[PDB]
Amino acid sequence: EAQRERRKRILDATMAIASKGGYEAVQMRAVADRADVAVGTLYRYFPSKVHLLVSALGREFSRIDAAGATPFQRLNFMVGKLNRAMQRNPLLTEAMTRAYVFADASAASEVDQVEKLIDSMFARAMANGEPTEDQYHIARVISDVWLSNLLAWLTRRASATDVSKRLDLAVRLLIG
Amino acid sequence: SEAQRERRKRILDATMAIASKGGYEAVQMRAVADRADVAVGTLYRYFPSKVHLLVSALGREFSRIDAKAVAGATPFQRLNFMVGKLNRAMQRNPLLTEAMTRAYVFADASAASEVDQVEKLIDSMFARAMANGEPTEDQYHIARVISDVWLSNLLAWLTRRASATDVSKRLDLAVRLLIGD
Which end of chain B is more exposed for a tag (fewer CB within 10 A), N or C? Predict the structure, then answer.
């Protein structure tokens, strides 16, 4: 109940800083200072800003975790919520997307944890009860369309609304 | 001119060779101009960056493939065959895949045109293969979804969070989920 408080303050600081100044504002020194932790402690829990941002994203997803007749409607509702959230936080989205661009093997765990989460959130959105294999697969496809189009967005070759459009199109092609 | 097409051809040939042999890092303007036997300035003129070079070369590749028979009986089979071939080519050339992947991740606004152009080529290929002729709008959309799956999983592979095998499997999965028959 003490390491939990530390992790809490740390991911809090991470989220606030990323929200206020984007990826470039997320420095280990800055986060450590804002979270009132030893820098070494921060590095001991999160070896980089990628780990920080991805863990933060994960926590936010698990918190979002805690509406429709057909799987199409329920999933479109889920995608709609997350999409609204994305558009409501441009700089945070920049931070997360950049984090996923720079995420390598060293962040594997932290990334996997997010996958399992968001995929589950999609799968369980589609399924009445335990989700099927195909529904998990569909979730992963959704996430991939999301990430690719976010890659276009980050480099200013597409807008957030373009991302939204592509996602809706994908949902419809998959389970429409 | 006619010499224009020749210059461009040698340039993209050099791009392909260098990228395939030494990956993204190897593709430097002076090296390409050197191997292609052109002036650095004319290179910079026709292709402003290594992103332009790589994306343009990929475009030409898909143009050639589209140019040059037992074919699939369904959209699913034809697209599965297509993706299959491209996938084997991908596994046979990890460094070329690395160069192209980095090219598309690092592609910015100043290349936004070229990207889109090649985006139209690739997709069209897929779409036409699905239709075995004039594609529907939805088949173009499916082409784009396939490309997105490809790019994301290549982003995973690039950063050693996934294998080439995983990329291939994800593509097969996407194909079946989208037009399985």
Answer: N
Query: Counting beta carbons within 10 angstroms of the beta carbon of residue A75, is it exposed (0 to 12), middle (13 to 18) or buried (19 or more)?
Result: buried
Resolution in A: 2.6
What is the number of other CB atoms lying within 10 angstroms of the CB of residue B47?
24
If you search the block for the tokens 């390409």, which residue do you land on?
A: B32
Provide the shortest C-alpha distance from residue B92 to chain A (in Å). Answer: 23
CA distance A100 to B82: 29
Task: Locate B132 and state its tokens.
Answer: 């075995």
Residue A61 CA, distance from chain mean position: 7
**CA B78, CA B71: separation in Å to the nearest integer?**
6
Expressed in angstroms, the distance from the first to the final Cα of chain A is 45
Asked if B160's CB is within 8 angstroms of A134's CB, the reply is no
Instruction: Assign B90 to helix, strand or coil.
Output: helix
Name the experiment that determined this structure.
X-ray
Per the document, the length of chain B is: 181
Contact A45, A102 (CB under 8 A): no
Query: How many residues are given for chain A?
Result: 176
Q: Which two tokens stand for residue B90?
A: 């991908």
CB nearest A104 (choices: B145, B161, B173): B161
Tokens of A80: 């709609």
Kindly give the residue spans of alpha helices, DSSP state H, lying in chain A: 3-21, 28-35, 39-45, 49-65, 71-87, 90-102, 108-126, 133-154, 160-175
Domains of chain B: 1-181 (1.10.357.10)
